[PDB]
Amino acid sequence: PTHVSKTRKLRGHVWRPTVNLDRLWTLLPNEARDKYLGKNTEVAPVINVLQSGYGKVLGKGRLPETPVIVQTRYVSRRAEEKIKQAGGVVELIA
Amino acid sequence: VAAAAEKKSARQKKRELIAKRAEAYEAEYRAAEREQIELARKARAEGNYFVPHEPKLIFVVRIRGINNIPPKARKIMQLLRLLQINNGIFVKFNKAIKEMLQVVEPYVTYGIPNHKTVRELIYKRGFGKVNKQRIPLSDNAIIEAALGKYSILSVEDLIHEIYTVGPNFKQAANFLWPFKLSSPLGGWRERKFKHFIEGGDAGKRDEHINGLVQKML
Amino acid sequence: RSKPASENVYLKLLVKLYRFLARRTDSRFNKAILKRLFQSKTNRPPISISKIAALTSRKSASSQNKTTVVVGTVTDDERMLTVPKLSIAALRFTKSARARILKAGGEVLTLDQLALRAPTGSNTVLVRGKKHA
Amino acid sequence: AHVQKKNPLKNKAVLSRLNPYAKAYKANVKINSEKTPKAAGEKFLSVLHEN
Amino acid sequence: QQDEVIWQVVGHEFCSYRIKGEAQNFCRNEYNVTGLCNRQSCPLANSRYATVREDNGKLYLYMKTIERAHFPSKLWQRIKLSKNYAKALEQIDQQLLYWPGRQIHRCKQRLTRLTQYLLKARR
Amino acid sequence: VNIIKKRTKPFKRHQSDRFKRVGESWRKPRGIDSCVRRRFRGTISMPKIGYGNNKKTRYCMPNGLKAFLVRNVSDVELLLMHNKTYAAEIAGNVSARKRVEIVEKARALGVKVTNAGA
RNA sequence: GUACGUGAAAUUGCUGAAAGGGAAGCAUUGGAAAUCAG
RNA sequence: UUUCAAUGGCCCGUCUACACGGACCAAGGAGUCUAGCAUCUAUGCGAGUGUUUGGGUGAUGAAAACCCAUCCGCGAA
RNA sequence: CUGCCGAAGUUUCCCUCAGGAUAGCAGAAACUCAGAUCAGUUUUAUGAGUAUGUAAAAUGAGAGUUUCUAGUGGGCCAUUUUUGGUAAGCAGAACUGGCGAUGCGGGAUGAACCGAACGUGAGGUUAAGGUGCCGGAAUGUACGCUC
RNA sequence: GAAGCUCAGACGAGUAGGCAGGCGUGGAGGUUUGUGACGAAGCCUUGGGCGUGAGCCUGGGUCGAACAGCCUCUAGU
């Protein structure tokens, strides 16, 4: 818009995306979280970070104590132990 | 009938209180003037010399404009609240004030007023600084609101607090706005910007400042 | 400042309501909101459900039923999966945050609702969003 | 309030408002009389009429 | 939605019954009495009010109700006065005694000017 | 309350009389050395906010009535509640038939018409 | 009226009015003459 | 409105007293569009965000509107 | 078109260059304490040899900030110091104000002299300078000098 | 006409520059049952009125077909 401009007032005056453990439980479908988080079930949920375009699973954050299997290409050196006491397992994608 | 009744009675009793106060102050002025006369007469008779009294109150009037003034002097003007020609302010005459005044000696005139000029000023040209506003003193309630903490309840109490230099002299300035005086009737002297002793009009002038105010006022 | 720079009529109603509350009561809470409702968008940072939950259940708690008040946006934090029962008043809640409060928790309020509830702002915590951005 | 500023010195009604004392102020008072005690020290006359 | 948001939309800037000039604005709306645009007298923005307007030798009145205000056909009802200027005045103040009185001083004054028409029209 | 005008003469543009290309309408002198810009003694005056008239008597005809432009019968019909404040002004491009219709309506409302003699 | 719708200014002529002894133009205040207005 | 009297009034613009431009009038006539970047304000959404490269639909007006597809960009380290 | 706010000429250094800087000023947004929190100011005490500083009484004012961002970075005039100086001026620095952006009264007239810092008016009173006439205002009063 | 009403006080030069509110022009969307051959726009005018101003309304004459107010958009303003 020229009418608001200053000229109309001067007239005359001259590859590896990263995911941390505070976010794995957000990658599930919400019904999977509803029916699998916190329930003492024999079978544990499985998370494939690669299906969300994530290469390496870093370990920042706390975890719920529900066991969960995480499938990943690469993993940070603490991210695996935190899921040990979380009761779930980590196994490595080829 | 009630509510307003007790307010009127308290209003009434306050009216006699300032009446009683005013009587006390007037007796104080007359007694002070009398002993001045008697101690002068007695000393002059028996022979020994009486001496004047170092004054603590003087009235100051700025007589030069706002152009061509050194930065040292205009700074003093700001600290004195003399920011305009033909203004006027009171200052507690002491060593700090006296030594301050000679800096602006050619730019102000100062001297010791007596009770009449104080009373005339407040009544006629007395404007009170209420809430950072130049509010005239048309009522005693105006002064009560701003000086009730210091037990000053009327114009006459303010006049005594000023003229006799009470402890609340400092606690009365920011209640009172500078006296914006008119140009003096009859004029100044022929050469206004010489020292008063030299036939001019600037500087300390004592018993001949009362005259000036009557004109300026 | 003396008026908000937005043209939102609903925001101007809040300003109209809280001008009255500030100038007809002595509550400094109402004055605080009025000063913060005049603020620009980047001076009103968001707040998170995680932050509010931490700020309520903090140290000696002392939150109880005190309704949390913030003048801004209350965004969600997916990093938390356990959301406590909360009572929150704000200009606007993101869709995810509103659902997470309602489905498992307490209530969401707008600022006009808060005035009808606690016009003096009694028993409220007046949080503010992180200005570091 | 106070549309116009009135001088107590000229408007007598405004004095009655400001001073509940101008009713009886009694400016002039006989404090002399027939009996004036002229008193100027004798040596004060000597030093005055000196040189 | 509500009456303030309606006022904030139509009242301030755009209405078909509003007339701006050099620095003044009037409300032509047939249901306003003072004829000028404000929140207290806005026809579109506010709830039930009362007005009167001329027709071929008589005056007649507009009102609203709150329950029926969603149905514009009978949102307004019309009552007719064609007997006398004075009797119109007593009628008008009567039908607004049980109603807020902030409008009568404008309403009752409007009448006599409309009736003054008929006299001047006759002359 | 009498209507008061601080100034009656208009502010003519500098040298608007020595040239036919420089117009009567006021223009602010921009030149740094303009004796009119520096407001020398004897030079023409410049519009200032100090000449603004009283808000109570501003926009009022010499008889204390404000002008309202009227183009059809509807406009004057809207003036019935201000017959004491606003005087109607028939627009220039209103036909002869409408002018007599408006003016007769305005007479019925008792509202002042400034140019009824047309 | 084909030098063709409207026909501005610069510019020229005629009539009327007024002023003018080495300029004028402009501004403020009024008088006079003309002309309006409520 | 004209004119008279008294009083005052150096020709304007530009540069740095000048000087340089100006015979008069009319029309035209000079900070524009676009890309990047930055601040600020406003609006929408919010750990997300952005569908107009593309597909569907719109025939009664169709270069619009509306719907769908997030490969991807920026952000989340 | 009107209104409002409104500097700078020298700083802060930096530079190859013109410049920027950087301030300062003017601002624009956020946030402390109702304070000894300040000051182109004075005073008192205090050491050292009226001034000096520090600390504190007077005095006026609400006093701080961190952040980004326009324009300016000249010169002239006079005062005070001031070494080289000569028929005589002249040169050298440092400082101060005024001027640039400033109209008005006065000095016959004038970039700086004397007063005075400006919205539209009415009335009153003055500054500087004047009161024979031009010219508003005493061909005033008093005492002398001068042909 | 809360973007409103009301009371009080102080203040008013201004270059570069900073900020705010307005006047005017061509075209677009919306609205005013808007104006008009019983004379639109334009043009003239010792006619009148309004605004501090940019400018605006109107009387009379000439003229002969289109034009404007308001809220927004826009720019070869």
From Swiss-Prot, chain A:
Any one GO molecular-function label of the UniProt entry: structural constituent of ribosome
| Annotated transmembrane regions | none
Basic residues composition bias: which ranges? 1-12
GO annotation (BP), single? cytoplasmic translation
Q: Which residues form a coiled coil?
A: none
Q: Where in the cell is it found?
A: Cytoplasm
Query: Repeat: is it a keyword of this entry?
Result: no
Sorted alphabetically, the Gene Ontology cellular component annotations on this record are:
cytosolic large ribosomal subunit; preribosome
Q: Which domain of life is it from?
A: Eukaryota
Q: Name one Pfam family in it.
A: Ribosomal_L27A
Q: Which UniProt keywords apply?
A: Cytoplasm, Ribonucleoprotein, Ribosomal protein
Q: What else is known?
A: There are 2 genes for uL15 in S.pombe.
Give the record's family classification: Belongs to the universal ribosomal protein uL15 family.
SUBUNIT field:
Component of the large ribosomal subunit (LSU). Mature yeast ribosomes consist of a small (40S) and a large (60S) subunit. The 40S small subunit contains 1 molecule of ribosomal RNA (18S rRNA) and at least 33 different proteins. The large 60S subunit contains 3 rRNA molecules (25S, 5.8S and 5S rRNA) and at least 46 different proteins.
Q: What is this protein's function per UniProt?
A: Component of the ribosome, a large ribonucleoprotein complex responsible for the synthesis of proteins in the cell. The small ribosomal subunit (SSU) binds messenger RNAs (mRNAs) and translates the encoded message by selecting cognate aminoacyl-transfer RNA (tRNA) molecules. The large subunit (LSU) contains the ribosomal catalytic site termed the peptidyl transferase center (PTC), which catalyzes the formation of peptide bonds, thereby polymerizing the amino acids delivered by tRNAs into a polypeptide chain.
What HAMAP family does the record tag this protein with? Ribosomal_uL15
Q: What is this protein called?
A: Large ribosomal subunit protein uL15A
- Organism of derivation: Schizosaccharomyces pombe (strain 972 / ATCC 24843)
Swiss-Prot record, chain C:
Chain positions with Phosphothreonine modification: T73, T75, T120, T124
Q: Which family does it belong to?
A: Belongs to the eukaryotic ribosomal protein eL18 family.
Q: Which residues carry this modification: Phosphoserine?
A: S2, S50, S122
* Protein name per Swiss-Prot or TrEMBL: Large ribosomal subunit protein eL18A
In the record, biological process GO terms are: cytoplasmic translation
Task: List the cysteine pairs that form cystine.
Answer: none
A single GO molecular-function term is: structural constituent of ribosome
GO CC aspect terms: cytosol; cytosolic large ribosomal subunit; preribosome
Question: Where does the UniProt annotation locate this protein?
Answer: Cytoplasm
What does this chain do? Component of the ribosome, a large ribonucleoprotein complex responsible for the synthesis of proteins in the cell. The small ribosomal subunit (SSU) binds messenger RNAs (mRNAs) and translates the encoded message by selecting cognate aminoacyl-transfer RNA (tRNA) molecules. The large subunit (LSU) contains the ribosomal catalytic site termed the peptidyl transferase center (PTC), which catalyzes the formation of peptide bonds, thereby polymerizing the amino acids delivered by tRNAs into a polypeptide chain.
Subunit info here reads:
Component of the large ribosomal subunit (LSU). Mature yeast ribosomes consist of a small (40S) and a large (60S) subunit. The 40S small subunit contains 1 molecule of ribosomal RNA (18S rRNA) and at least 33 different proteins. The large 60S subunit contains 3 rRNA molecules (25S, 5.8S and 5S rRNA) and at least 46 different proteins. eL18 interacts with NAP1.
Extra remark: There are 2 genes for eL18 in S.pombe.
UniProtKB/Swiss-Prot annotation, chain E:
- Where does this one sit in the cell? Cytoplasm; Nucleus
Look up the domain of life of the source. Eukaryota
Instruction: List the disulfide bonds in this chain.
Output: none
What is stated as this protein's family in its record?
Belongs to the MAK16 family.
Name the UniProt record assigns to this protein = Protein mak16
Write down the species: Schizosaccharomyces pombe (strain 972 / ATCC 24843) (Fission yeast)
Taxonomy of the source species: Eukaryota, Fungi, Dikarya, Ascomycota, Taphrinomycotina
Swiss-Prot record, chain F:
Check the record and name the SUPFAM superfamilies matching this protein.
Ribosomal protein L32e
Chief subcellular location: cytoplasm
One Gene Ontology term of the biological-process aspect is: cytoplasmic translation
In terms of InterPro entries, this protein maps to: Ribosomal_eL32, Ribosomal_eL32_CS, Ribosomal_eL32_sf
Concerning Pfam families, the annotation shows: Ribosomal_L32e
Places the protein is found:
Cytoplasm; Nucleus
Keyword list (alphabetical) reads: Cytoplasm, Nucleus, Phosphoprotein, Ribonucleoprotein, Ribosomal protein
Q: GO CC terms for this protein?
A: cytosol; cytosolic large ribosomal subunit; nucleus; preribosome
Q: Which residues carry this modification: Phosphoserine?
A: S74
| One MF term in the entry's GO annotations | structural constituent of ribosome
Q: PROSITE patterns from the entry?
A: RIBOSOMAL_L32E
Record bears the keyword Cell membrane: no
Q: What does this protein do?
A: Component of the ribosome, a large ribonucleoprotein complex responsible for the synthesis of proteins in the cell. The small ribosomal subunit (SSU) binds messenger RNAs (mRNAs) and translates the encoded message by selecting cognate aminoacyl-transfer RNA (tRNA) molecules. The large subunit (LSU) contains the ribosomal catalytic site termed the peptidyl transferase center (PTC), which catalyzes the formation of peptide bonds, thereby polymerizing the amino acids delivered by tRNAs into a polypeptide chain.
Q: What else is known?
A: There are 2 genes for eL32 in S.pombe.
Family under the similarity heading: Belongs to the eukaryotic ribosomal protein eL32 family.
Q: Which PANTHER family match?
A: 60S RIBOSOMAL PROTEIN L32 AND DNA-DIRECTED RNA POLYMERASE II, SUBUNIT N, RIBOSOMAL PROTEIN L32
| Name of the protein | Large ribosomal subunit protein eL32A
**What organism does the UniProt record list as the source?**
Schizosaccharomyces pombe (strain 972 / ATCC 24843) (Fission yeast)
